[PDB]
Design an enzyme around this catalytic site. Structure first.
Site, PDB file in Angstrom:
ATOM      1  N   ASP A 178      11.329   8.872   1.086  1.00  0.00           N
ATOM      2  CA  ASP A 178       9.907   8.825   1.447  1.00  0.00           C
ATOM      3  C   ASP A 178       9.738   9.033   2.950  1.00  0.00           C
ATOM      4  OD1 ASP A 178       7.088   8.360   1.357  1.00  0.00           O
ATOM      5  OD2 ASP A 178       7.425   6.243   1.828  1.00  0.00           O
TER       6      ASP A 178
ATOM      7  N   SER B 124       8.436   6.123   5.078  1.00  0.00           N
ATOM      8  CA  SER B 124       9.363   5.019   5.336  1.00  0.00           C
ATOM      9  C   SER B 124      10.588   5.501   6.100  1.00  0.00           C
ATOM     10  CB  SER B 124       9.806   4.383   4.021  1.00  0.00           C
ATOM     11  OG  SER B 124       8.694   4.078   3.203  1.00  0.00           O
TER      12      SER B 124
ATOM     13  N   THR C 160       5.608   3.211   3.849  1.00  0.00           N
ATOM     14  CA  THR C 160       6.145   1.879   3.765  1.00  0.00           C
ATOM     15  C   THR C 160       6.809   1.708   2.439  1.00  0.00           C
ATOM     16  OG1 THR C 160       4.604   0.913   5.213  1.00  0.00           O
ATOM     17  CG2 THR C 160       5.474  -0.513   3.627  1.00  0.00           C
TER      18      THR C 160
ATOM     19  N   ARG D  56       9.383   1.270   9.552  1.00  0.00           N
ATOM     20  CA  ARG D  56       8.641   2.406  10.113  1.00  0.00           C
ATOM     21  C   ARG D  56       7.126   2.222  10.003  1.00  0.00           C
ATOM     22  NH1 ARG D  56       9.969   8.624   8.419  1.00  0.00           N
ATOM     23  NH2 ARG D  56      11.765   8.172   9.774  1.00  0.00           N
TER      24      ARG D  56
ATOM     25  N   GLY E  69       0.098  -0.820   3.822  1.00  0.00           N
ATOM     26  CA  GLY E  69      -1.282  -0.381   4.030  1.00  0.00           C
ATOM     27  C   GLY E  69      -1.658  -0.429   5.497  1.00  0.00           C
TER      28      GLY E  69
ATOM     29  N   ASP F  22      11.240  -1.762   4.907  1.00  0.00           N
ATOM     30  CA  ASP F  22      11.648  -0.825   5.951  1.00  0.00           C
ATOM     31  C   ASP F  22      10.899  -1.174   7.237  1.00  0.00           C
ATOM     32  OD1 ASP F  22       9.079   0.425   4.970  1.00  0.00           O
ATOM     33  OD2 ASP F  22       9.625   1.922   6.476  1.00  0.00           O
TER      34      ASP F  22
ATOM     35  N   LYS G  22       7.695  -5.897   9.174  1.00  0.00           N
ATOM     36  CA  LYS G  22       6.750  -5.962   8.055  1.00  0.00           C
ATOM     37  C   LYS G  22       6.896  -7.224   7.204  1.00  0.00           C
ATOM     38  CE  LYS G  22       6.952  -0.929   7.731  1.00  0.00           C
ATOM     39  NZ  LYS G  22       6.818   0.251   6.836  1.00  0.00           N
TER      40      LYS G  22
ATOM     41  N   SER H 207       4.090   3.548   0.039  1.00  0.00           N
ATOM     42  CA  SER H 207       4.280   4.975  -0.244  1.00  0.00           C
ATOM     43  C   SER H 207       5.656   5.288  -0.838  1.00  0.00           C
ATOM     44  CB  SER H 207       4.068   5.803   1.024  1.00  0.00           C
ATOM     45  OG  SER H 207       4.977   5.418   2.037  1.00  0.00           O
TER      46      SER H 207
HETATM   47  B1  LIG Z   1       3.358   1.519   5.495  1.00  0.00           B
HETATM   48  O1  LIG Z   1       3.608   2.899   5.455  1.00  0.00           O
HETATM   49  O2  LIG Z   1       2.406   1.220   4.507  1.00  0.00           O
HETATM   50  C1  LIG Z   1       2.876   1.039   6.886  1.00  0.00           C
HETATM   51  C2  LIG Z   1       2.995  -0.467   6.889  1.00  0.00           C
HETATM   52  C3  LIG Z   1       2.201  -1.123   7.971  1.00  0.00           C
HETATM   53  C4  LIG Z   1       1.681  -2.425   7.424  1.00  0.00           C
HETATM   54  C5  LIG Z   1       3.134  -1.459   9.091  1.00  0.00           C
HETATM   55  N1  LIG Z   1       1.498   1.409   7.238  1.00  0.00           N
HETATM   56  C6  LIG Z   1       1.231   2.129   8.318  1.00  0.00           C
HETATM   57  O3  LIG Z   1       2.064   2.519   9.091  1.00  0.00           O
HETATM   58  C7  LIG Z   1      -0.191   2.441   8.603  1.00  0.00           C
HETATM   59  C8  LIG Z   1      -0.551   3.754   7.974  1.00  0.00           C
HETATM   60  C9  LIG Z   1      -1.896   3.906   8.050  1.00  0.00           C
HETATM   61  C10 LIG Z   1      -2.424   4.896   8.844  1.00  0.00           C
HETATM   62  C11 LIG Z   1      -3.784   5.056   8.925  1.00  0.00           C
HETATM   63  C12 LIG Z   1      -4.612   4.218   8.206  1.00  0.00           C
HETATM   64  C13 LIG Z   1      -4.082   3.223   7.414  1.00  0.00           C
HETATM   65  C14 LIG Z   1      -2.718   3.071   7.334  1.00  0.00           C
HETATM   66  N2  LIG Z   1      -0.265   2.597  10.035  1.00  0.00           N
HETATM   67  C15 LIG Z   1      -0.960   1.767  10.751  1.00  0.00           C
HETATM   68  O4  LIG Z   1      -1.583   0.853  10.291  1.00  0.00           O
HETATM   69  C16 LIG Z   1      -0.957   1.969  12.084  1.00  0.00           C
HETATM   70  C17 LIG Z   1      -1.162   3.206  12.608  1.00  0.00           C
HETATM   71  N3  LIG Z   1      -1.155   3.362  13.970  1.00  0.00           N
HETATM   72  C18 LIG Z   1      -0.942   2.287  14.784  1.00  0.00           C
HETATM   73  C19 LIG Z   1      -0.743   1.062  14.224  1.00  0.00           C
HETATM   74  N4  LIG Z   1      -0.764   0.939  12.864  1.00  0.00           N
HETATM   75 MG   LIG Z   2      12.195  12.310  10.812  1.00  0.00          MG
END
Ligand SMILES: *[B]([O])([O])[C]([C][C]([C])[C])[N]C(=O)[C]([C]C1=[C][C]=[C][C]=[C]1)[N]C(=O)C1=[C]N=[C][C]=N1
Ligand SMILES: [Mg+2]
Ligand SMILES: *[B]([O])([O])[C]([C][C]([C])[C])[N]C(=O)[C]([C]C1=[C][C]=[C][C]=[C]1)[N]C(=O)C1=[C]N=[C][C]=N1
Ligand SMILES: *[B]([O])([O])[C]([C][C]([C])[C])[N]C(=O)[C]([C]C1=[C][C]=[C][C]=[C]1)[N]C(=O)C1=[C]N=[C][C]=N1
Ligand SMILES: *[B]([O])([O])[C]([C][C]([C])[C])[N]C(=O)[C]([C]C1=[C][C]=[C][C]=[C]1)[N]C(=O)C1=[C]N=[C][C]=N1
Ligand SMILES: [Cl-]
Ligand SMILES: [Cl-]
Ligand SMILES: [Mg+2]
Ligand SMILES: [Mg+2]
Ligand SMILES: [Mg+2]
EC number: 3.4.25.1
Lengths: 196, 222, 226, 204, 195, 212, 233, 195, 196
Positions: free
Chosen positions: C166, C169, C1, C19, C47, C17, C33, C129
């Protein structure tokens, strides 16, 4: 342990406390941490007492054998021998050594060899657990080309503070002066340096 | 504690045709969440009409390819410039990998070329040297995304002929080089979308009786 | 993110972003987000996705009730205080890393929040990240007295740095501009620099390709009359 | 040990032109041991369909929980719950168990009865909503399903074409997973008719 | 405990359960009945951790018997199985969970059909033509996959069960000291005293 | 992995599955789990793919050297013991192997040895090895006789692998059949489980649990 | 297996139209203590190569001695040591890459990340990376440690792909490197203001710049920042 | 493997050893002979870790057979037992020790006396009237303490052995698939084919 | 973190760096670690940013409520409230706080509260990871009853050295002056204090 070596106009001076500890027990309060590997090449020892003694004994042997073949070794050469032992045996050693020596060609030189076994040539060096508390003081008060009396005062004041704050440091302040004139030993007792 | 292994990401794909073979791989190189390089070649021409790629830990991958290229060189010296056949190369690679059974090359190896009858050949290895000739194989990070698609679109798995309803299978008609390259490009485009370690560029090495040809295509850089 | 916040002349802008990732897999390519706490207080979250969403809804809900109780438009410091005290209580276990921005009767504001409950003030901020890639851009191009147009440009460029460099992201850039004395404009998919190219082939199957065992109508309707 | 892969299984959903499709495999196992080939993972509350992968006890528990909640909803609201609303209810219900979660991977599918708009959504085990336009995947072969869907899918497919696409996505993904398979079901959903089809697949 | 089997035939459900009880080093008993009658047409066999098994079974038994008296009515096997599943699904997130796996064999007098339910300690329920818990299924499901029919008689079911027990006695390392077999049908529950 | 081998009137039947897995991921459905050591010796493969492949093709080199040096076919006993003695040297190092060495000589007749990476070497009439071994044992033990026809024995082996392919998640793909006689082994085809299951179900009347 | 004691932080670099640029700060850290302030981490080899090293300083000094010895050894029985048979960047890199991978394979690594920047005989730009694991890669921009996360994004805006190299001048490239060093000083807790920079051009040769400082820093905005949220004074 | 027993009577030594071989989940074989003839009047039974047992036994066998050929003479049971003990005492401080326990039953032709030696994997030797390895002794020594005499016949020894095996089959959890019994006396070694 | 508070003739001055770090990444280079719990009672924060913020916010609340009932609280009282929170929650907190305040009756006072939750009234106090490097310097250079200009120079020079040697410390040097005259904020940038 609080140890330091300082170059000055006429040469170099080594300084050290006299405390050896097993945890919080002071196993020796009158230790000599300033040790001789050649006539005018000495070192300060910190870390393991066994390791640094073993290393210093081996270095003294190497330089004694060097002298018999090639004449008096340089301070740089002595530092290199310390480095070789500290670097190649880094996994098994706990030794922080400051090498200080006087040539006539190169005059006073100081090399510090921390845990990793790296070498650093410096105008002055500080090491040991007590050195942390005097980085600020030593940086602010060090000048190049000091006199003998000024350098003795600089080391005396610096180690006094290191002793004051570090529990692993204490006892007397030993010093060794290295110049063209020869080798002079100095000692300073608690009643003298505590009131500074 | 020191960890002698790492993960450089990436993904590779080998497809055997009727009189040709392709070995493709993305050009991205990574550690953790960083990109090291957007163009770091991963598929190599090893001589004797053989192409190779060792995907996973790049240091082990480069070491293996380097040692195999070396093996080809000494095979010529020791056996009167004889051409190293794809089956013989495969067996040789097994011994290179198993030689480090108790401290393995952390890679997924794929080689491609032509067999001694001129037909397309792909061989696939695990890290410790087990191998098998295959018509189709993806390797690396996005292998799990690509292989099912290739089961469906190359071997016509779970496909049947209309009107019969599950009775008659779709016949296994052969695929041209133009048709295979379409499937490779779509495989990597799809893998790039859903796998973070896949992207930047796609490099394809095509092997025929005429020799080894190269094709490059852009992939998404996010 | 990658999420950023940038102050400017007459307000503040935030961006992000789109993703979301489970390990090395992309779960959603066009994730939203940028969250709305109140009409003119928005925050971006990094997170744990469920946590950033939940903690924003809860505080946003209580902020709305507070605004109705006091007959006043909500303040950013109130959202900040309620978020930090909630997150502190849960000792970092609620994995929400937030950039909170907004305009209110006191003026324009920009804050960051971390999961353990610590807050920070700044003219430019980045989290996630890809925050290092974004902060590199912000540290290189930020200046005092930015215009609205310059701040949007700087914010989106900082997100792009995260998108491209990154792996955590990617995809698109979302933006939200909050100017003093104006409605907050939420620019969903402000940039779209990652459209997938046309596929080489169509994978539409001939009808009857899949083998079937049984067919039946499913009754979704209620119990019928007569 | 890992709760999400003791029993195994998969669910996939897709949108088409004025229609949606949701599909699942029929396996329930105890790690390597296959136990049941009739364990359906798709349920429906009115016209809203819910697929659930993961730990099987929680799959059953949540179905019973959402049947409970949608029945009360209907009595009070005097109307069936819609997909958009049900999605929020799933998210709320999962997040209330934040630090003691149900080990599941839910998937919602349906058509809004008023607007006629097709709708799909996915969740993680603790409530996060993934509202995709194209497709949603879940279960032990989710990586495989992502690869199939991302290559096979195209927008605005007719119901009978969409059936073929989703069926091939499931079947070929399941065949690359040890803990999925043992049969499969596909629901084709239009505004006022729903067809259910059991698929013939390899039984290993 | 160890091996519990179940098979649903045309007109009945047959449950087989081992007789051995082993305290680590020694076999303390070779005639243990690992089952409880929940209602006149519903039987539950069980296996898991010591103490928990009997404690859980008798607790379920007491609850169903209470229901029977209150309503002057016997719950359907499906209803009883759902009640049991919920108790185990509740239990798995408790301070100390019940470490018990069960088979529920019942004859539904309303539908005139036998019914077999397999439920593990997590609360995982499945209705099956034949089932098992523990390492039993690893040996027995292949035999049942080959020989089973929905239209088998009770006598044919017992013969197919003997073939399962013979395989277990051949290939399993533990001596489970034979099985107690019980049949559940329209007339109630009875024990096969010679097996 | 499910592999079996059994002695009978018409020699030995060897039957294996084809699946290879890495965790839950199905890595291959087309694996050759039978090794053609020579025209009279077969080896089965279960456990680590590489360990089995490498050391069993190595075994074939040792057997070829024996008959070059001794001008005589190697015994099944001697061939199996070369492999067991080898893996015993590596004991503790982490090799992972479960194998049957199957053959027929004049002095021994049809012989099967179970060889193991823990050093275990056992002669016997019936063996099943792998994650789905228990499932295959059920079918074998209830239908096995010494007086089976080559045709009926081949089917029993095929059917026993099918049983395990169905129930065991880490077994499947296809069935490879071999029949070992006084005049050598004879391959009896690759049989896809996806077609074999429905065929057997219909013709045999089995698997009434499953719907078709 | 060891742990690094005295360490050096980021090394950053990039290609431009006629050559390559590389840079690294002059700090030797001892954990959180910024112990040694005069450490040179760019080590030139001949007049066509500069090796930049990060990580353990004792291992860096060992590598420095290996390179010094390599030059000595190449001169032995070599009349063309200062001409056709001089050390190339590609030769120096491959040697180091061999040593790094060998040492990791004995479970006793040189705890470093290395970038070899230089220009080949035919004028081609050389820029390649290697580390303690023996992992190697090349790119128009390369950076180690924190540089990878912060410098690369900035340097990639100048040279995003291969075709951007001929369009990039030495003035534009140096400007980007110097800016990146400032950003690292803002954000890396184990960095120093003092650094060294080296340019290797196919026309003007090796230019080694010592005692550079980060300048034109923005700090004035700090005066307006008060408290952590609600505080006004 | 599992159970190995030994008993020394008036004029012979009797060794009993289980037939089962178990690879974790399944019983792979039910006719395994856990013994090797070291010399015409000396028999060694064995039990321990898989592979090591047979490898050790055959290694000892080869060494004693080599001695027999070299000297054209059979070593006394006492001498063989001492050789075996030393090999195990050497083994226990090796890189990878032999995880093998043995009983050595022999008839000394010089002294005209049967002799039974019990040796564990550490190299712990004891001469006994009756012995066992593993969990066997826990059940069987109480019976042998009660019924044993030094002047018992071979037939009485077999009856007392049947009483031991019956107790084991009653109280041990593992199905060891019966025992192979072998007698060692002045005429050599023979197997009791019906037990 | 490098923080200090120093009493002088006219009152007391608080000083602090502006660096916040997540490992080696500087998460904030312009942090304000000098925080206000009452008009003329401020504190310096070191350790966890979350913990010390949460504590300071609670203390500000307590002193605001104290003031409404009993009038202006003493510096000793403010220190006691900090102590109560730090002592009773010692297992769950990582907070090193220096409390400094100006009364008219008591003039400038400094209280330091280390990890344990103990209280120590001192003429001056130093804390944070960077304080270790200036114990020697501060002990040698501190005098009682200094002037405002002298005290500013003492803090500026002290924190300059702490920043120089400690990686966890850096950015600008913030200061807050507490006297009868009022509350003055000072800031000193790198170009100024690095050349000292
Ligand atoms: B970003 O990279 O921080 C992103 C932002 C989020 C608020 C949309 N985070 C994630 O994509 C998180 C990563 C993560 C994975 C595992 C534990 C904690 C954080 N992903 C998720 O929260 C996620 C993963 N699978 C399904 C739904 N959400
Ligand atoms: Mg790719
Ligand atoms: B000094 O404190 O570092 C000191 C120097 C030594 C050369 C005389 N070292 C010790 O006293 C060490 C312990 C130690 C303390 C602090 C840092 C590192 C090591 N002591 C010993 O080696 C020792 C103690 N008792 C007996 C023998 N040796
Ligand atoms: B079988 O299950 O033992 C099977 C046969 C092997 C010889 C090809 N083994 C495997 O598939 C093993 C995994 C395994 C599964 C079950 C039990 C034991 C081991 N797989 C591999 O060894 C392997 C090798 N390369 C790639 C993937 N998997
Ligand atoms: B200082 O280093 O102690 C500083 C003081 C704090 C009040 C701003 N603390 C931090 O920077 C801490 C980490 C730390 C470093 C060194 C010693 C003790 C603590 N940082 C954080 O608490 C932090 C980091 N990132 C986000 C939020 N909080
Ligand atoms: Cl000493
Ligand atoms: Cl703070
Ligand atoms: Mg179950
Ligand atoms: Mg299977
Ligand atoms: Mg600093």
């Amino acid at each position: 342990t609080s140890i330091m070596a300082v170059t000055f106009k006429d040469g170099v001076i080594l300084g050290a406390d006299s405390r050896t500890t097993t945890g919080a027990y002071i196993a020796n309060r009158v230790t000599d941490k300033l040790t001789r590997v050649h006539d005018k090449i000495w070192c300060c020892r910190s870390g393991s007492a066994a390791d640094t003694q073993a290393i210093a004994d081996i270095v003294q042997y190497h330089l004694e054998l060097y002298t018999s073949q090639y004449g008096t070794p340089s301070t740089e050469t002595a530092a290199s021998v310390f480095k070789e032992l500290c670097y190649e045996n880094k996994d098994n050693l706990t030794a922080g050594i400051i090498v200080a020596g006087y040539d006539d060609k190169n005059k006073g030189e100081v090399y510090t060899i921390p845990l990793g076994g790296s070498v650093h040539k410096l105008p002055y060096a500080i090491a040991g657990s007590g050195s942390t508390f005097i980085y600020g003081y030593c940086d602010k008060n060090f000048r190049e080309n000091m006199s003998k009396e000024e350098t003795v005062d600089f080391i005396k004041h610096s180690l006094s503070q290191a002793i004051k704050w570090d529990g692993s440091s204490g006892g007397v302040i030993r010093m060794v002066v290295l110049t063209a004139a020869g080798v002079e030993r100095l000692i300073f007792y608690p009643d003298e340096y505590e009131q500074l | 504690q020191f960890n002698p292994y790492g993960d450089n990401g990436g993904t590779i794909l080998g497809i055997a045709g009727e009189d040709f073979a392709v070995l493709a791989g993305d050009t991205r190189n990574i550690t953790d969440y960083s990109i090291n390089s957007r163009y770091e070649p991963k598929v190599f021409d090893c001589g004797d009409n053989i192409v190779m790629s060792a995907n996973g830990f790049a240091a082990d991958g480069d070491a293996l390819v380097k040692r195999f290229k070396n093996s080809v060189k000494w095979y010529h010296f020791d056996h009167n410039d004889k051409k190293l056949s794809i089956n013989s190369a495969a067996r040789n690679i097994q011994h290179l990998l198993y030689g480090k059974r108790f401290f393995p090359y952390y890679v997924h190896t794929i080689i491609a070329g032509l067999d001694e009858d001129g037909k397309g050949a792909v061989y696939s290895f695990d890290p410790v040297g087990s191998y098998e000739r295959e018509q189709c194989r993806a390797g690396g990070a996005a292998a799990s995304l690509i292989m099912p698609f290739l089961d469906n679109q190359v071997n016509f798995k779970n496909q049947y002929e209309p009107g019969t309803n599950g009775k008659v299978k779709k016949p296994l008609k052969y695929l041209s080089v133009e048709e295979v390259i379409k499937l490779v490009r779509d495989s990597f485009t799809s893998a790039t979308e859903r796998h973070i370690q896949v992207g930047d560029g796609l490099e394809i090495l095509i092997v025929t009786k005429d020799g080894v040809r190269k094709e490059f295509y852009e992939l998404k850089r996010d | 993110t990658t999420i950023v916040g940038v102050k400017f002349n007459n307000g503040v802008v935030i961006a992000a972003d789109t993703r979301s990732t489970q390990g090395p897999i992309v779960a959603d390519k066009n994730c939203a987000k940028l969250h709305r706490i109140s009409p003119k207080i928005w925050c971006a979250g990094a997170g744990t996705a469920a946590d950033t969403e939940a903690v924003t809804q809860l505080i946003g809900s209580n902020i709305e009730l507070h605004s109705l109780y006091t007959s006043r438009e909500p303040r950013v410091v109130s959202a900040l205080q309620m978020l930090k005290q909630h997150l502190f209580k849960y000792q970092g276990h609620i994995g929400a890393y937030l950039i909170v921005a907004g305009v209110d009767p006191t003026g324009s504001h920009l804050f960051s929040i971390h999961a353990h409950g610590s807050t920070d003030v700044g003219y430019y901020l980045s989290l996630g990240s890809g925050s290092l890639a974004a902060m590199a851009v912000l540290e290189s191009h930020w200046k005092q007295d930015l215009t609205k147009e310059e701040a949007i440009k700087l914010a989106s460029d900082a997100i792009q740095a995260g998108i491209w460099n990154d792996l955590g992201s990617g995809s698109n850039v979302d933006v939200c501009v909050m100017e003093i004395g104006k409605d907050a404009e939420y620019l969903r998919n402000y940039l779209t620099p990652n459209v997938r190219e046309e596929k080489q082939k169509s994978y539409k199957f001939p009808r009857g390709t899949t083998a079937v065992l049984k067919e039946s109508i499913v009754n979704i309707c209620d119990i019928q009359e007569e | 040990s890992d709760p999400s892969s003791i029993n195994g299984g998969i669910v996939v959903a897709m949108t088409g032109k004025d229609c949606v499709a949701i599909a699942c495999d029929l396996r329930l196992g105890s790690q390597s041991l296959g136990v049941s080939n009739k364990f359906e993972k798709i349920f429906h509350y009115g016209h809203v369909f819910l697929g659930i992968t993961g730990l099987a006890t929680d799959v059953t528990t949540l179905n019973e929980m959402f049947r409970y909640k949608t029945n009360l909803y209907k009595l009070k609201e005097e109307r069936a719950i819609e997909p958009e609303t049900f999605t929020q209810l799933v998210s709320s219900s999962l997040y209330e168990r934040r630090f003691g979660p149900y080990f599941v991977g839910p998937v919602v599918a349906g058509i809004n009865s008023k607007s006629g708009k097709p709708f799909i959504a996915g969740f993680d085990l603790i409530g996060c909503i993934d509202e995709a336009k194209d497709f949603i995947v879940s279960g032990t072969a989710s990586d495989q399903l992502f690869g199939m869907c991302e290559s096979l899918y195209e927008p605005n497919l007719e119901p009978e074409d969409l059936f073929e696409t989703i069926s091939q996505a499931l079947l070929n993904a399941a065949d690359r997973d040890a803990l999925s398979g043992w049969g499969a079901v596909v629901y084709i959903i239009k505004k006022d008719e729903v067809v259910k089809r059991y698929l013939k697949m390899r039984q290993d | 405990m160890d091996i519990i089997l179940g098979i649903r035939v045309q007109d009945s459900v047959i449950l087989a359960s081992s007789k051995a009880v082993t305290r680590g080093i020694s076999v303390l008993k070779d005639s243990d009945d690992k089952t409880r009658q929940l209602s006149p047409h519903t039987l539950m066999s069980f296996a898991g951790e010591a103490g928990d098994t009997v404690q859980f079974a008798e607790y379920i038994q007491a609850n169903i018997q209470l229901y029977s008296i209150r309503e002057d009515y016997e719950l359907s096997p499906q209803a009883v199985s759902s009640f049991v599943r919920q108790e185990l699904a509740k239990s798995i997130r408790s301070r100390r969970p019940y470490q018990v796996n069960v088979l529920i064999g019942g004859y539904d007098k309303k539908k005139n059909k036998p019914e077999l339910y397999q439920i593990d300690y997590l609360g995982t329920k499945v209705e099956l033509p034949y089932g098992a818990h523990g390492y039993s299924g690893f040996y027995t499901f292949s035999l049942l996959d080959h020989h089973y029919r929905p239209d088998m008689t009770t006598e044919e079911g017992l013969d197919l069960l003997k073939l399962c027990v013979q395989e277990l006695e051949k290939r399993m390392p533990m001596d489970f000291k034979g099985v107690i077999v019980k049949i559940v049908d329209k007339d109630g529950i009875r024990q096969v005293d010679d097996f | 992995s499910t592999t079996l081998a059994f002695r009978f009137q018409g020699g030995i039947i060897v039957a294996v599955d084809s699946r290879a897995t890495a965790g839950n991921w199905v890595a291959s459905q087309t694996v050759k789990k039978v090794i053609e050591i020579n025209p009279f010796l077969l080896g089965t493969m279960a456990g680590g793919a590489a360990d089995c492949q490498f050391w069993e093709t190595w075994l074939g080199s040792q057997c070829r050297l024996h008959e070059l040096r001794e001008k005589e076919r190697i015994s099944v006993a001697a061939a199996s013991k070369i492999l067991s003695n080898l893996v015993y040297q590596y004991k503790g190092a982490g090799l992972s192997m479960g194998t049957m060495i199957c053959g027929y000589t004049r002095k021994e007749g049809p012989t099967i040895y179970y060889v193991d990476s823990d050093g275990t070497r056992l002669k016997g009439d019936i063996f099943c090895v792998g994650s789905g071994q228990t499932f295959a044992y059920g079918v074998l033990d209830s239908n096995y006789k010494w007086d089976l026809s080559v045709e009926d024995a081949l089917y029993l082996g095929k059917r026993s692998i099918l049983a395990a392919a169905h129930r065991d998640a880490y077994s499947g793909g296809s069935v490879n059949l071999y029949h070992v006689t006084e005049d050598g082994w004879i391959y009896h085809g690759n049989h896809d489980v996806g077609e074999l299951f429905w065929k057997v179900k219909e013709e045999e009347g089995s698997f009434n649990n499953v719907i078709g | 297996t060891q742990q690094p004691i005295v360490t050096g932080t980021s090394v950053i670099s990039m290609k431009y139209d006629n050559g390559v640029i590389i840079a690294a700060d002059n700090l030797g850290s001892y954990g959180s203590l910024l112990r040694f302030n005069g450490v040179e981490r760019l080590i030139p080899v001949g007049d066509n190569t500069v090796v930049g090293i990060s990580g353990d300083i004792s291992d860096m000094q060992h590598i420095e001695r290996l390179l010094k010895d390599l030059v000595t050894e190449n001169a032995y029985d070599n009349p063309l040591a200062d001409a056709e048979e001089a050390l190339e960047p590609s030769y120096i890199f491959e040697y180091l890459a061999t040593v790094m991978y060998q040492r990791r394979s004995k479970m006793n690594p040189l705890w470093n990340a290395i970038i070899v920047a230089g220009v080949q005989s035919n004028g081609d730009q050389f820029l390649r990376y290697v580390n303690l694991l023996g992992v190697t890669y090349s790119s128009p921009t390369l950076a180690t440690g924190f540089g990878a996360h912060m410098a690369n994004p900035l340097l990639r805006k100048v040279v995003d792909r291969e075709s951007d190299i001929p369009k990039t001048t030495v003035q534009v490239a140096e400007e980007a490197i110097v800016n990146a060093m400032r950003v690292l000083y803002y954000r890396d807790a184990r960095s120093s203001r003092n650094f060294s920079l080296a340019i290797i051009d196919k026309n003007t040769g090796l230019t080694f710049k010592k005692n550079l400082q980060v300048e034109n820093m923005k700090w004035d905005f700090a005066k307006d920042i008060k408290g952590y949220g609600t505080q006004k004074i």
